[PDB]
């Protein structure tokens, strides 16, 4: 994989836009605002372990990674040609949209004055997690969990056991090299299990940040004036191997809590991506 | 829209100033300090949903975007001339004025010692939201709400339903591309519904930040020594299409809470804008 | 030790990768998720002093330093040659993996609603400590403890007494030059005792940060796009004396607390290291 | 006002030093530590509104701006000379002195253990406000209050009514261009009313920051190694019109609270200024 000069001429540079909607737990359908669709953009009620050895989170309570594989313009006539062209992601403008909606404090969440059930509807608060990646192949994931004893559903989610065909081991609570996967499905890989693998991702740039806590104030900036350069130390950005551009993200704002038993629901927001790509000559 | 050289000569550069007052809910009139006017700069008492399916916020409890369209000096004799001139916004000095007024802790808000009704009058705290934009056309808005079931008044505010003529759908809690609008009216577009659209705003620069929480300390800096460059990666700033310069903003400092049922009122502060514009030759 | 030119030619530059798993107290074995292995990645329950003069922490309740000594490619034929080559660490990409696992709030920890035993499983919070070092010899440690009267176990951990053969002195609560050691064993040197020695470490670069508190929200960033330059003011990086590269770290995220007597367990996460090394001519 | 070259030669550059003591409410005299003087550097007890329409803060409970007008060396023989010289403020080293005094937690304030009246004397906490300005004329102020109904004393303080001769209007809770003043007296303009006017102050540089909250920890840095450049985008600093250099500031650290009814007293600290000035030729 020799990377040569930038290709010049008509259409050697292109822009790709996309928004990835969050995957907090409640699927996009049913759309009915009375049959579950009113939780889209949120997780369903987080259910807790019933004992130290009985922790089975429902799939719709586990935020998962969002991902999209975008198709770029075709490039090579001759595939047996000594020198071909590849799309190179140069930079990305990305933005999490909707933080202002968090200013709705007039709903029916747990109120701030619980003695009289007054005040305001408590806004979303808590743990936040923002990660996005742009690469030329799926984001490589390293699994690591809080508890290797957690009983994740066998269906509907991709967990470490889905990959290894075996039960998690104690090493899965730290770095177990065996527990790897690729983010190749949207809404299926729980973010409390799968993390960007720093030992791989040679062709993907990822950026994440985590803020913990139970009532931590969410903080978010948004501007259309910032660009993230995806070029590495050698001036080379992610190269689209099959002309497939991979976008990955997760944007958890925290939880809203209901007036019944403090049931928490994760809140996620959509992320916008505008990727600038250029053609690169490759040998 | 070919952008050419900067125009030189007498009056090729100009400065425009404006302050946009906040739109927190209580309109500017009545002015009477006994008939409602005493709430100008604040929202009226935030009223809460009465059930999970009955959330009808009053219009005067919903901060909305502030916007102004400023007229710039006329430019072109010949409109059928191959090369015309356009005003280009180069930079802006902007400032949110009045945070010092938040130091009044001698009023009648909920006191800090509630056992004896003593201490100080609790100052403004909570969720903060600061956004401003400068562009050559209205700020493009993407709607996204906390709850697609919220029953916003049909009159007095522009909501997603005003635009689509239909009820919100579950997709409106995430990114629904159909829910778009333009900030073309001051005090009408609620900020908990309408967000800068990152997929558009090619000719507008916007910058916002959100801090959540219920008692989060407001933080604010102000100096007349800072400038925000509005030029893009190509050195081109927003171009005033009809010589109309659009200013948009929202500056929520948090809430003050009364001594009756913890009623919260949003507090907003005015924003000052000093935009430097230059004439640009356009083909 | 005269440092000359960089060696050029085939294989003069090399990359080395490694992940160091945390050493919070529970060893890697037994692996059994019922015999202790379920605490791997965590410390065992923190036990408190029984009086002002009886403080005997269990070894498995004390996070210790992680360290690894990596073997690099051999270099010198002639050891009696006027000019030899040495491996020089130029830079390191390092990352603490797994913060997303902290988003599991569905387990059996102390719940956020203790009155009804509801809400969510409190996530990991508290004191955080992140330190990593890359050097050409073991990290030099300076001992300093909260209490020189603490009765650390004599076996299983390397403490100041292990080194001095005598009991700690009051000076061990501040800087006592006599209390020095080298981080030459993984999982043995408690981080509450051993700190990077600023008076030594001429051939090691270390970087640490501490955040205290009992419920402080853990914060962590991770990206594969950042590099830490290890070169000193003279453009020289750590030199691998016996071609042994030393990696050291500790990454405490805070504690989880159980539903029984608020027993706290430290949580640590693995750290990834990708070190770029180049050959240097030395006289 | 044409600004020409910098004047060169003997004494063309000069330094001016000054410290402005805080104006929190209690005047410098009486000096008696039993007759009120013990509150100098603090405000007197903050008294609260007795109803929604009765808010009469005492003057000594309202921090006001500190300001000093310094006389610089005389400059011009000939005032009818085509080209004169003016003093130009180039930069300032400024510092808020005394934060370490906030480490006195052995006094008689509300204690941290209120059940037994033990622990420590609660240190100053809360809302902080730091602003300083250096200009060639008085700082231009824009009035904006929390409540236009507040009954400020007519004597002893300069309020919006002092300036307009009329009662405040609802517009005074937002930006009302009529409510302007100049900071031309020390200890008279309340900071909860008067803010730097961004629409004016062409010849003054101001910098401020606000942190709200009721128990927010005060934060402060101090070093003698930092300089603030006062030069504008054209390399011109404030010009001293009548060779009078204006220094303005306010530095509120928060409040201390007593053991009786949680009475709060604002704490302010003095600010030091070292201004470097140079002579400028003006046409």
């Amino acid at each position: 994989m020799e990377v040569l000069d930038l290709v010049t001429g008509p259409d050697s540079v292109t822009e790709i836009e996309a928004f990835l909607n969050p995957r907090m737990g409640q699927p996009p359908t049913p759309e009915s605002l009375t049959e579950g669709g009113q939780y889209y953009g949120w997780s369903r009620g987080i259910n807790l372990a019933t004992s130290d050895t009985e922790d089975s989170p429902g799939n719709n309570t586990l935020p998962t990674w969002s991902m999209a594989k975008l198709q770029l313009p075709m490039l090579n006539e001759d595939l047996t040609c000594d020198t071909l062209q590849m799309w190179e992601a140069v930079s990305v403008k990305t933005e999490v949209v909707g933080s202002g909606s968090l200013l709705d404090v007039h709903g029916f969440n747990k109120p701030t004055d619980t003695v009289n059930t007054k005040g305001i509807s408590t806004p979303v608060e808590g743990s936040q997690y923002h990660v996005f990646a742009v690469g030329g192949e799926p984001l490589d994931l390293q699994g690591l969990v809080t508890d290797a004893r957690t009983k994740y559903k066998e269906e509907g989610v991709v967990t470490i056991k889905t990959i290894t065909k075996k039960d998690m081991v104690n090493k899965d609570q730290v770095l177990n090299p065996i527990s790897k996967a690729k983010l190749d499905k949207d809404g299926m890989y729980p973010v409390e299990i799968w993390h960007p693998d720093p030992a791989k991702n040679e062709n993907t740039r990822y950026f994440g940040n985590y803020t913990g806590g139970t009532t931590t104030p969410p903080v978010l900036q948004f501007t259309n004036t910032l660009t993230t350069v995806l070029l590495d130390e050698n001036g080379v950005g992610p190269l689209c191997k099959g002309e497939g551009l991979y976008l990955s993200c997760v944007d958890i704002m925290g939880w809203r809590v209901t007036r019944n038993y403090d049931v928490h629901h994760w809140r996620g927001l959509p992320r916008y991506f505008k990727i600038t790509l250029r053609k690169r000559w490759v040998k | 829209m070919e952008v050419l050289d900067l125009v030189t000569g007498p009056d090729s550069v100009t400065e425009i100033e404006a302050f946009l007052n906040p739109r927190m809910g209580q309109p500017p009139t009545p002015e009477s300090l006994t008939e409602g006017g005493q709430y100008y700069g604040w929202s009226r008492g935030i009223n809460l949903a009465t059930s999970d399916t009955e959330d009808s916020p009053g219009n005067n409890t919903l901060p909305t975007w502030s916007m102004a369209k400023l007229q710039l000096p006329m430019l072109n004799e010949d409109l059928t001339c191959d090369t015309l001139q356009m005003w280009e916004a180069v930079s802006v000095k902007t400032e949110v004025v009045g945070s010092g007024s938040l130091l009044d802790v001698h009023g009648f808000n909920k006191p800090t010692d509630t056992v004896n009704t003593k201490g100080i009058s609790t100052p403004v705290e909570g969720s903060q939201y600061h956004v401003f934009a400068v562009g050559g056309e209205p700020l493009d808005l993407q709607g996204l709400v906390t709850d697609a079931r919220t029953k916003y008044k049909e009159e007095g505010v522009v909501t997603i339903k005003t635009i689509t003529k239909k009820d919100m759908v579950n997709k409106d809690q995430v990114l629904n591309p159909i829910s778009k609008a333009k900030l073309d009216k001051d005090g009408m577009y609620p900020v908990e519904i309408w967000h800068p659209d990152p997929a558009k705003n090619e000719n507008t620069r916007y910058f916002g930040n959100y801090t959540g929480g219920t008692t989060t300390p407001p933080v604010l800096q102000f100096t007349n020594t800072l400038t925000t460059v509005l030029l893009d990666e190509n050195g081109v700033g927003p171009l005033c299409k009809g010589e109309g310069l659009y200013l948009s903003c929202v500056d929520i400092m948090g809430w003050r809470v009364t001594r009756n049922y913890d009623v919260h009122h949003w507090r907003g502060l005015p924003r000052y804008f000093k935009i430097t514009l230059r004439k640009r030759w356009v083909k | 030790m005269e440092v000359l030119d960089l060696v050029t030619g085939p294989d003069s530059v090399t990359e080395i990768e490694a992940f160091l798993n945390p050493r919070m107290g529970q060893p890697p074995t037994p692996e059994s998720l019922t015999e202790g292995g379920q605490y791997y990645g965590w410390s065992r329950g923190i036990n408190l002093a029984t009086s002002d003069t009886e403080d005997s922490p269990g070894n498995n309740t004390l996070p210790t330093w992680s360290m690894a000594k990596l073997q690099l490619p051999m270099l010198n034929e002639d050891l009696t040659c006027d000019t030899l080559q040495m491996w020089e660490a130029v830079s390191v990409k390092t990352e603490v993996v797994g913060s997303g696992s902290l988003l599991d709030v569905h387990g059996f920890n102390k719940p956020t609603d203790t009155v009804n035993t509801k809400g969510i499983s409190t996530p990991v919070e508290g004191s955080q400590y992140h330190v990593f070092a890359v050097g050409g010899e073991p990290l030099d440690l300076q001992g300093l403890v909260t209490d020189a009267r603490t009765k650390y176990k004599e076996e299983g951990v390397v403490t100041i007494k292990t080194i001095t053969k005598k009991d700690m002195v009051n000076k061990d609560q501040v800087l006592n030059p006599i209390s020095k050691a080298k981080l030459d064993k993984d999982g043995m040197y408690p981080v509450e005792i051993w700190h990077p020695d600023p008076a030594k470490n001429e051939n090691t670069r270390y970087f640490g940060n501490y955040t205290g508190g009992t419920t402080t929200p853990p914060v962590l960033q991770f990206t594969n796009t950042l590099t830490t330059v290890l070169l000193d003011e003279n453009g020289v990086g750590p030199l691998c004396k016996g071609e042994g590269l030393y990696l050291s770290c500790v990454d405490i995220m805070g504690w989880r607390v159980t539903r029984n007597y608020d027993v706290h367990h430290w949580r640590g996460l693995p750290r990834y290291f990708k070190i770029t090394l180049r050959k240097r001519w030395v006289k | 006002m044409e600004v020409l070259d910098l004047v060169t030669g003997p004494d063309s550059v000069t330094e001016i030093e000054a410290f402005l003591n805080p104006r929190m409410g209690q005047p410098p005299t009486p000096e008696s530590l039993t007759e009120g003087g013990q509150y100098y550097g603090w405000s007197r007890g903050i008294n609260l509104a007795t109803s929604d329409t009765e808010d009469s803060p005492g003057n000594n409970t309202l921090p006001t701006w500190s300001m000093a007008k310094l006389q610089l060396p005389m400059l011009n023989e000939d005032l009818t000379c085509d080209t004169l010289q003016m003093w130009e403020a180039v930069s300032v080293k400024t510092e808020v002195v005394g934060s370490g005094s906030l480490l006195d937690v052995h006094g008689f304030n509300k204690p941290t253990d209120t059940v037994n009246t033990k622990g420590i004397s609660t240190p100053v906490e809360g809302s902080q406000y730091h602003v300083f300005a250096v200009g060639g004329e008085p700082l231009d102020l824009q009035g904006l209050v929390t409540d236009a109904r507040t009954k400020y004393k007519e004597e002893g303080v300069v309020t919006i009514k002092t300036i307009t001769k009329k009662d405040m209007v609802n517009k005074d809770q937002v930006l009302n261009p009529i409510s302007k003043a100049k900071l031309d007296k020390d200890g008279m303009y309340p900071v909860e009313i008067w803010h730097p006017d961004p629409a004016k102050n062409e010849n003054t540089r101001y910098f401020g920051n606000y942190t709200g909250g009721t128990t927010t920890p005060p934060v402060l840095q101090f070093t003698n190694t930092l300089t603030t450049v006062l030069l504008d985008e054209n390399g011109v600093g404030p010009l001293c019109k009548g060779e009078g250099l204006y220094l303005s500031c306010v530095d509120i650290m928060g409040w201390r609270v007593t053991r009786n009814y949680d009475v709060h007293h604002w704490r302010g600290l003095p600010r030091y200024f070292k201004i470097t000035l140079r002579k400028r030729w003006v046409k």
């Binding site: 997690y129 940040n209 803020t211 978010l220 900036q221 993200c249 | 800072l226 925000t228 050195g235 | - | 985008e233």
Partner: peptide, 29 residues
């Protein structure tokens, strides 16, 4: 305080100090 953000959270914008304006400007005319 203790709740940071510096990656995936749409990042911080800056401003230019007035006196630095020409330079910064001269690069985009």
């Amino acid at each position: 305080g203790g709740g940071g953000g510096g990656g995936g959270a749409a990042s911080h914008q800056r401003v230019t100090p007035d006196w630095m304006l020409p330079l910064i400007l001269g690069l985009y005319g």
